[PDB]
Every structure is written in structure tokens, then in C-alpha cells.
Design a protein around this ligand. Structure first.
Ligand SMILES: O=c1[nH]c(=S)[nH]c2[nH]c(=S)[nH]c12
Length: 266
DNA sequence: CTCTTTTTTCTCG
DNA sequence: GCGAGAAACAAAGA
DNA sequence: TTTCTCG
């Protein structure tokens, strides 16, 4: 999941589990609780969920007054809300049980993580990861963005994916963003001129805010509609510009990369 | 049998 | 620094 | 790394 899907999950969770008391926590895969399942079980049991926030692709459960559970879904993490008597499915790893239902975390590839953090350690946690600004007009300052692009020789697609220029882009939306900004994924960022950087800046914000509006692309968050709006991701061999160009797929810095060669020249 | 495909972090030259 | 490659893991799809 | 797929 990328920022839009996580934000969709956040919103659904906010509606359903805020105000609920955690009755018990169970794990068939405790190793995904990086700070220690035992400790997490002991601190959070009996606590009431006060809210859910998000930073980039990270979910943040606000539980009791002094704890935060930071959850990352990585590649295939999924939450679902189920009755207390729901059967176990094969890749369920964790469950937070309430009085009248449970929240189950599943992850086929086991990449997803949980970390229990002190409330005043949350801001330092994201500082250490060097996570960039949220993709909004208010937080995503184009001037700093521009200064960083100009000082670097990195290719624009893997640089954007670093989460440091701006938070929340993953493989789908960076491909959609570069298509929309008419920029080649392998463009060296110090070659970008001012007007391209401006278009790229706005496009990053516009695409992500749109995806959020449509509930993300495709359990919680499984009713998204952004996938219908995708212009290049996963559409190899299909048309992009009303002239005849087909979408090409190449490998860039280890990632499958979809682009329209005629519209996205260097 | 083999290989490649689908977020974050680490190695290493 | 930097980037190429791989690690963590499961299930495809060839 | 493990298992499936027409296997
Ligand atoms: O956190 C990341 N760091 C790097 S270097 N690349 C990358 N690609 C995605 S997606 N996330 C990240």
C-alpha cells in the first residue's frame, strides 16, 4: 500500500475502533512486533484507542495517553474487522480483540511491522527515518524541493521513492506522477528546469489527493476506485497519447517502471 | 529443476 | 556520499 | 526463501 491506501485504512479505522477498549492482544507471528510482543501485550491490554494518525505510509494508533503503535503494511499488509468468532485465515499474524469484535492484521509476505513507541518519541522516530513532508500544498514547500533536486545527480524516480523529498509515493503513484508531469523516470534531477519542477510538485500533490478521494487502488480499503484512473501503471502495451504510443515497461533502480516514451523523453 | 515478478533496509566496492 | 544488488517472505507464472 | 501453475 502507498500513502492513499494507508490513509483510506486510517479513515476506516478512525470510524470504527476509536473509543474501544482493547480486551486482549494475540499473536501467531510475534516476530513482526519489533519492539517485543510481550511488552506490547502488557502495555496496551486494557487501554482505549484514542485515535489513528498517519505519517507517510506509516499508520499510528494512539492508544492510552502515553503510547503509540506504529504500524507499516509494507507490500501486502491488510487489516480487517471481524466478529469475535471469526475463523483464523492462513496469513493472519496479530489480533487486537475488543468487547464486540476484533482487528486482525494479515500479511502474506510477513514484511509488515509493529513498533510500540512513547508518545514523545513519535516525532523523533520520524526524524531519524528522515521522512520528508506530507504531500500537501501547506507542507510540501516547492522551494526546498527545488533546491534538493538541483544539488543531486540521482535519477528522479528512485529519488522520489526515497521518501525524503516528499512522503508517501510508492511504485504506482510515482509512475503516474512522472507521466502526468511529462518527466522520464531516469531524468537526472539537476537537469530538471524550474517549470518542470513546478509541474512535478503540483502533480505529486494532485495525484495523491485524488487517490485518497477515491479510496485508493485495489479487507479494509478494498473498495477503492483509483485503479480505474491509473494512466500508466500496469498498463504495458496499451495506448497513452492519442497518436499511437504504447506504454513501455523498463527496470529502474530495481523497480518495474511504466512510462510513455513519446511524452516522457528526457 | 530454474528464473523473475510483486516497502524498507542492509552490504559492499 | 553513491548505486547495484540483495535481504526479509510467499505465491505465483513461466 | 517456499510453493504453485497445465507441473
Ligand atoms: O524508503 C525507501 N528508501 C529507498 S532508497 N527506496 C525506497 N523505495 C521505496 S518504495 N521506499 C524506499
Amino acid at each position: 500500500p502507498e500513502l492513499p491506501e494507508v490513509e483510506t485504512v486510517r479513515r476506516e479505522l478512525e470510524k470504527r475502533i476509536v473509543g474501544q477498549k482493547i480486551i486482549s492482544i494475540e499473536a501467531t507471528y510475534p516476530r513482526m512486533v519489533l519492539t517485543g510482543f510481550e511488552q506490547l501485550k502488557k502495555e496496551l491490554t486494557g487501554k482505549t484507542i484514542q485515535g489513528i494518525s498517519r505519517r507517510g505510509k506509516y499508520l499510528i494508533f494512539e492508544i492510552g495517553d502515553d503510547f503509540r503503535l506504529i504500524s507499516h503494511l509494507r507490500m501486502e499488509g491488510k487489516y480487517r474487522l471481524a466478529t469475535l468468532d471469526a475463523p483464523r485465515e492462513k496469513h493472519d499474524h496479530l489480533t487486537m480483540k475488543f468487547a464486540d469484535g476484533q482487528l486482525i492484521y494479515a500479511d502474506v509476505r510477513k514484511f509488515g511491522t509493529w513498533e510500540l513507541i512513547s508518545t514523545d518519541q513519535v516525532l523523533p522516530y520520524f526524524l531519524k527515518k528522515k521522512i520528508g513532508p506530507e504531500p500537501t500544498y501547506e507542507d510540501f514547500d516547492e522551494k526546498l524541493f527545488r533546491e534538493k533536486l538541483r544539488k543531486s545527480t540521482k535519477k528522479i524516480k528512485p529519488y522520489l521513492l526515497e521518501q525524503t523529498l516528499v512522503a508517501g509515493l510508492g511504485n504506482i503513484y510515482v509512475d503516474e506522477v512522472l507521466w502526468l508531469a511529462k518527466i522520464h523516470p531516469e531524468k537526472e534531477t539537476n537537469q530538471l528546469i524550474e517549470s518542470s519542477i513546478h509541474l512535478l510538485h503540483d502533480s505529486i500533490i494532485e495525484i495523491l489527493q485524488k487517490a485518497i478521494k477515491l479510496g485508493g487502488s485495489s479487507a479494509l480499503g478494498s473498495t477503492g476506485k483509483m485503479q480505474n484512473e491509473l494512466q500508466v501503471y500496469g498498463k504495458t502495451g496499451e495506448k497513452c497519447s492519442r497518436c499511437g504510443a504504447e506504454i513501455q515497461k523498463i527496470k529502474v533502480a530495481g523497480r518495474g517502471t511504466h512510462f510513455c516514451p513519446v511524452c516522457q523523453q528526457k
